[PDB]
Amino acid sequence: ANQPVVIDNGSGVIKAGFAGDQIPKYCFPNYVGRPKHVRVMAGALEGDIFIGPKAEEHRGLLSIRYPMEHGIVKDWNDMERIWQYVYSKDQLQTFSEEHPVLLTEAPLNPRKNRERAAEVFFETFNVPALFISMQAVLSLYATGRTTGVVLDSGDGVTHAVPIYEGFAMPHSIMRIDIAGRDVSRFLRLYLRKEGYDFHSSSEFEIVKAIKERACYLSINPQKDETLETEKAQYYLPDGSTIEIGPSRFRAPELLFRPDLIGEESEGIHEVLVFAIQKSDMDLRRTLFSNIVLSGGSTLFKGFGDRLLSEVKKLAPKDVKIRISAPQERLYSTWIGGSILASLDTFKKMWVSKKEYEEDGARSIHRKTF
Amino acid sequence: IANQPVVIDNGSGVIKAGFAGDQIPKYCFPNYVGRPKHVRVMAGALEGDIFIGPKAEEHRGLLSIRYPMEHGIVKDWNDMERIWQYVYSKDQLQTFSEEHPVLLTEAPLNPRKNRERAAEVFFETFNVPALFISMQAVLSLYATGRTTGVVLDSGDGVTHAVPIYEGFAMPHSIMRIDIAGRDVSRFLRLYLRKEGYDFHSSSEFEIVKAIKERACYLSINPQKDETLETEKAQYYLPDGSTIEIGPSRFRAPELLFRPDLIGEESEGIHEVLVFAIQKSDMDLRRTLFSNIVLSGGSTLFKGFGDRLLSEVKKLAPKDVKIRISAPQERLYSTWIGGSILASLDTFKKMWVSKKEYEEDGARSIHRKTF
Amino acid sequence: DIAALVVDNGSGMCKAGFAGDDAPRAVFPSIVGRPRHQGVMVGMGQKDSYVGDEAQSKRGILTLKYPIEHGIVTNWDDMEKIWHHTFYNELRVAPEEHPVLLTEAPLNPKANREKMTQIMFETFNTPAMYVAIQAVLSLYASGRTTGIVMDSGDGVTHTVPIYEGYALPHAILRLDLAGRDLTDYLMKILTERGYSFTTTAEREIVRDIKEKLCYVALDFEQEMATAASSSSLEKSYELPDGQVITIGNERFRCPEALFQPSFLGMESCGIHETTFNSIMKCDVDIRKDLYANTVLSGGTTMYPGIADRMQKEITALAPSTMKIKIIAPPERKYSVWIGGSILASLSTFQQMWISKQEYDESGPSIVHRKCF
Amino acid sequence: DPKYADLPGIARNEPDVYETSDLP
Numbered sequence A: 001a002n003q004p005v006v007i008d009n010g011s012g013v014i015k016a017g018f019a020g021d022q023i024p025k026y027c028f029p030n031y032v033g034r035p036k037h038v039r040v041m042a043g044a045l046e047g048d049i050f051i052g053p054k055a056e057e058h059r060g061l062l063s064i065r066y067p068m069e070h071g072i073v074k075d076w077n078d079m080e081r082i083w084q085y086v087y088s089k090d091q092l093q094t095f096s097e098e099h100p101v102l103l104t105e106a107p108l109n110p111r112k113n114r115e116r117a118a119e120v121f122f123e124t125f126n127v128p129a130l131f132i133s134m135q136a137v138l139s140l141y142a143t144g145r146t147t148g149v150v151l152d153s154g155d156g157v158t159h160a161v162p163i164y165e166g167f168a169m170p171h172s173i174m175r176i177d178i179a180g181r182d183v184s185r186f187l188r189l190y191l192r193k194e195g196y197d198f199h200s201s202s203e204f205e206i207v208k209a210i211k212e213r214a215c216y217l218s219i220n221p222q223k224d225e226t227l228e229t230e231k232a233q234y235y236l237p238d239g240s241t242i243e244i245g246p247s248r249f250r251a252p253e254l255l256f257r258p259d260l261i262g263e264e265s266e267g268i269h270e271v272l273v274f275a276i277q278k279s280d281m282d283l284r285r286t287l288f289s290n291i292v293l294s295g296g297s298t299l300f301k302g303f304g305d306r307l308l309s310e311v312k313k314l315a316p317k318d319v320k321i322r323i324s325a326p327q328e329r330l331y332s333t334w335i336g337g338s339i340l341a342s343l344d345t346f347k348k349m350w351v352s353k354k355e356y357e358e359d360g361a362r363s364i365h366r367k368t369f
Numbered sequence B: 001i002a003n004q005p006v007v008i009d010n011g012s013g014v015i016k017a018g019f020a021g022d023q024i025p026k027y028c029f030p031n032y033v034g035r036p037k038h039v040r041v042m043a044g045a046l047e048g049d050i051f052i053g054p055k056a057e058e059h060r061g062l063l064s065i066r067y068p069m070e071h072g073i074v075k076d077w078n079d080m081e082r083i084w085q086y087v088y089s090k091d092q093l094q095t096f097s098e099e100h101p102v103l104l105t106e107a108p109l110n111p112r113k114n115r116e117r118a119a120e121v122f123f124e125t126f127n128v129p130a131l132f133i134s135m136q137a138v139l140s141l142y143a144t145g146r147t148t149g150v151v152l153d154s155g156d157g158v159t160h161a162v163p164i165y166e167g168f169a170m171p172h173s174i175m176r177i178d179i180a181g182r183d184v185s186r187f188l189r190l191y192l193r194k195e196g197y198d199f200h201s202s203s204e205f206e207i208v209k210a211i212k213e214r215a216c217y218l219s220i221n222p223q224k225d226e227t228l229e230t231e232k233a234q235y236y237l238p239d240g241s242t243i244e245i246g247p248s249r250f251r252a253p254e255l256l257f258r259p260d261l262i263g264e265e266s267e268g269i270h271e272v273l274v275f276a277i278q279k280s281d282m283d284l285r286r287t288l289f290s291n292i293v294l295s296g297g298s299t300l301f302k303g304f305g306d307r308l309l310s311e312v313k314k315l316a317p318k319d320v321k322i323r324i325s326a327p328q329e330r331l332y333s334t335w336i337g338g339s340i341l342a343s344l345d346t347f348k349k350m351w352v353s354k355k356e357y358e359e360d361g362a363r364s365i366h367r368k369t370f
Numbered sequence C: 001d002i003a004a005l006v007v008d009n010g011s012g013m014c015k016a017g018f019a020g021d022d023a024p025r026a027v028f029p030s031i032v033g034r035p036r037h038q039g040v041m042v043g044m045g046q047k048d049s050y051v052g053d054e055a056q057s058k059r060g061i062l063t064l065k066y067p068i069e070h071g072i073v074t075n076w077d078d079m080e081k082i083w084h085h086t087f088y089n090e091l092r093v094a095p096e097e098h099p100v101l102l103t104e105a106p107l108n109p110k111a112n113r114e115k116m117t118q119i120m121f122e123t124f125n126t127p128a129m130y131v132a133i134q135a136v137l138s139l140y141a142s143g144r145t146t147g148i149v150m151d152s153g154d155g156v157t158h159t160v161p162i163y164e165g166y167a168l169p170h171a172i173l174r175l176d177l178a179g180r181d182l183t184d185y186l187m188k189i190l191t192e193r194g195y196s197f198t199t200t201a202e203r204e205i206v207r208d209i210k211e212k213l214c215y216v217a218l219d220f221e222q223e224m225a226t227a228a229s230s231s232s233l234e235k236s237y238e239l240p241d242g243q244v245i246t247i248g249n250e251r252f253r254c255p256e257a258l259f260q261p262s263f264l265g266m267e268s269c270g271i272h273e274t275t276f277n278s279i280m281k282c283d284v285d286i287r288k289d290l291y292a293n294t295v296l297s298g299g300t301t302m303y304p305g306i307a308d309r310m311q312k313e314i315t316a317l318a319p320s321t322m323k324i325k326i327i328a329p330p331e332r333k334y335s336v337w338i339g340g341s342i343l344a345s346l347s348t349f350q351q352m353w354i355s356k357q358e359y360d361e362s363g364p365s366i367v368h369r370k371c372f
Numbered sequence D: 001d002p003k004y005a006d007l008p009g010i011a012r013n014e015p016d017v018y019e020t021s022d023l024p
């Protein structure tokens, strides 16, 4: 009777909506803004917590805080407030008691994060049922194929999950924390080295916009590094310009070379190829011909070409490789969650309120993955 | 107390007193005390010894003037107490001070002891039921009826710029300089001495101030105007004699924008405005350029708006909208905003009660403001 | 042996001397003063612009500009004047005869170092030169090769961890809050107290008040309560005129902005939190050693009690088992210079110079390949 | 408008808004 609610809990942007809808109707950034300046006049903006488009409109006034980092919830009160705002009147006007929830968690996350998320979604919101899911299965559901390897690169994490004919290899899952937010932080550092400083929390969101707009992945790193580059100019919100120069392309290369930021982790291409290669041999070809991209961080200009080149370098010689990707990558996971939640069999995958009241966290560990 | 609060905009040059109900300051007069110029001991001379308000204007030639407030700071506290008692006179407001609560106005970033002593005077000498001290920059936006803007209050004593976004004030972005109307008057006196005209007396400071108010304009291109032959506009003194002001008409107010000509180490009105805007957070800056509100008497200079627009244009980022909202009532905008604030029921929760001041002591008036 | 000059161009104060010496030969503020009045006739013995102590003595009439702001040279003509005064007037040495070991803060603009090298090689024609990170030199001065240097001067406060001589560029943390910001906050609170200081000349008076009177409170709230309830902390200072002005709680509110940037309006971490974050960015194995070798440097770390406050704050933040040891040598104000002198006195450093031949061959950009 | 007619210093015969030209 009550349509389940699908909440893709992105680290950068959270996407809430109803199951069965074509696109996530209620998308907004996953941060909480608080007014740092002092209120003097009557009739000022009300409330000391700003979430959603109100925060975006008055972004300069507020100081931003991110409840989620690298797929793990750090400030749990802020995450609780965020999910409460998802049920608010502004977005998705409902009552949390009536609607089962479909929350998405990054793979290989700590068990404590999942336990606390379930506790919040069963105690603070007295939902009838809950079901945690990974991004990869939902992306495959959205694209409509049971077979493939999902490389999802979000704001906090980037993970490769191979699933063959609906069977997931838990040991072949690969994950690194170098993701889009780390690219934005590296870009902030490089912009400081250029001359422009963005130390403010609000100005970090300007740096993120610069990352979204003026940044690309050169097909070959060192040739572009050697050659002089024209200084493309970007317009800041106030009106002043900035000449970016090499930081246009030296920033996203962090995704392929984590050692740029001093982290000794595999690159995104290495993540993909090792995720394929850890699986059984007989599936590898079928995995190489079915690669599904997701996450906003794979929208860099030239990401497809550089990823194809890197995988071709690392993959066995003469093996068919096609890198598929949905036309709208940001909403793919939520659309998948909606397609999953509409299934009758989803009722069998629930964690009912009685089940969580009886078994507790163990039940959440039994029915999740 | 349910009586009508009394709003007293405390200008360095001109104070404006009235009741909160009125749309305009019904009472307003210069902020100085005029004593007899000679030390009177014989009879038949100017009696009373203390001339305040239009009385001082009636016999202005014979008086020595003394302003209590300088740079928005009270210097002679006895004179300021006399001024405030005169506000509660038969001439002005014809009322007892103990009946009505009071709303003062004070310049931003002033000494704490000034506010503490003002509260002590208003609570001890006058048995006022309550008190509240506001900044004029906050009140200008109340008067204009808008929630956001950059208020550039260039009064007689102090010139300060304050940005407010959606009712949130930026205390660290506030800019303040002491080059204001009185300093422009002093520079005009110097330039008129260069014309050959002497105004040594403190009383003659009043007529050189009148010359500033009457015939002084800000030229968009001062070099071209200086090269161009001046019309030498004629001005009538109170006694009857005429004076040809000459190029000084455009040289005295120019120090507001470029004080360093006279060696003054000051930013300049356009500089403090632009730096107050730029010190704020980046996302707000465009909106802060789209809502600039003028206030204070010094903004009434002829051609002031055009020159300020030109300076802000050449200092602001290119192709950015600027709106210098200069209301015609900008001289009394601060009082009108104070009246609008005091009219609100929320003002009931803002002023400190007399018992609250007696119990908590001084720090109350510091903490209830913010 | 031709001794190589060492010129620490601090943001506020320029120090200069010869390699191998114990202390800088010349130590003067890095300011360029210009006369304020234009229209009137100018007297007989005058200079177009004054530099260093000459500007400081005559600051009453002059208007002062700092060439370096937040560790970034904004006025290159003024900085060139400062270098000319340093070499010809103060040191009294021909720049073409000796190499020069300049210093720069970490994470500065690349164009800053490039223009520094270009000015040194073209205008002054030095035979060679080098640019060194200030924190590395200050660690050299302390006689250590492992530790975390929190060097805080007039313009910037930068934290650099080093382990066994191997720097860790990804754990360096820079803050724009240092020195000048504290002087401006002292101006602000003084204005609240009653004494108004606005002109650039009065900035020197406020800076002197900060140097003489201010101190770091071990417990901020307790000291605030003591100041409110008693006048024991009030101390009197004499201005150059002779006016005596009393400073109360403002003695320990100006340096408190180091540990609470929210007073200054910046949503940044304090110096203790910056140091702790820089330590935590390092690998787990070396963190203990850093906790045992925290080194304070720069002039702004000379407040009384800053070592105890930093030790307390880091001990609160850090795990209980680890032993914290803030090293605050008495001569730390010059520690950035002294290590530089050591770095210029080493025999192995002759290969680290940027020779003029290499500069002509590769241009200014070689500074990014050689120095760091 | 006439409510401020009696005040001395109301500067009239001037525009109330000094602004740059709009751009599309």
Ligand SMILES: Nc1ncnc2c1ncn2[C@@H]1O[C@H](COP(=O)(O)OP(=O)(O)O)[C@@H](O)[C@H]1O
Pocket (backbone or CB within 6 Å): A009, A010, A011, A012, A013, A014, A153, A154, A155, A156, A180, A181, A184, A208, A211, A212, A213, A294, A295, A296, A297, A299, A300, A301, A329, A330
């Ligand atoms: N066109 C683009 N170019 C570069 N980066 C982009 C682009 N579009 C989105 N992003 C990045 O993608 C991130 C959002 O990823 P998202 O898919 O929301 O993560 P999650 O899966 O956690 O929701 C943002 O941080 C943003 O910087």
Ligand SMILES: Nc1ncnc2c1ncn2[C@@H]1O[C@H](COP(=O)(O)OP(=O)(O)O)[C@@H](O)[C@H]1O
Pocket (backbone or CB within 6 Å): B009, B010, B011, B012, B013, B014, B015, B136, B153, B154, B155, B156, B157, B158, B181, B182, B209, B212, B213, B214, B296, B297, B298, B300, B301, B302, B331, D009, D011
């Ligand atoms: N039309 C005018 N032209 C030039 N100056 C003026 C004009 N009208 C008023 N002033 C100046 O403005 C000053 C009054 O400023 P005021 O608004 O009282 O400041 P405050 O905020 O201290 O009350 C007077 O000293 C006067 O010289």
Ligand SMILES: Nc1ncnc2c1ncn2[C@@H]1O[C@H](COP(=O)(O)OP(=O)(O)O)[C@@H](O)[C@H]1O
Pocket (backbone or CB within 6 Å): C008, C009, C010, C011, C012, C013, C014, C152, C153, C154, C155, C156, C179, C180, C207, C210, C211, C212, C298, C299, C300, C301, C302, C303, C304, C333, C336
């Ligand atoms: N004894 C002291 N007590 C407090 N502050 C001091 C003391 N000595 C110097 N300072 C402060 O340190 C600053 C100078 O730091 P400095 O070491 O010169 O940094 P830099 O080398 O980057 O110029 C000055 O602004 C001054 O306020």
Ligand SMILES: [Mg+2]
Pocket (backbone or CB within 6 Å): A009, A010, A011, A135, A152, A154, A295, A333
């Ligand atoms: Mg995701």
Ligand SMILES: [Mg+2]
Pocket (backbone or CB within 6 Å): B009, B010, B011, B136, B155, B296, B334
């Ligand atoms: Mg006023």
Ligand SMILES: [Mg+2]
Pocket (backbone or CB within 6 Å): C010, C134, C152, C153, C154, C298, C299, C336
């Ligand atoms: Mg230093």
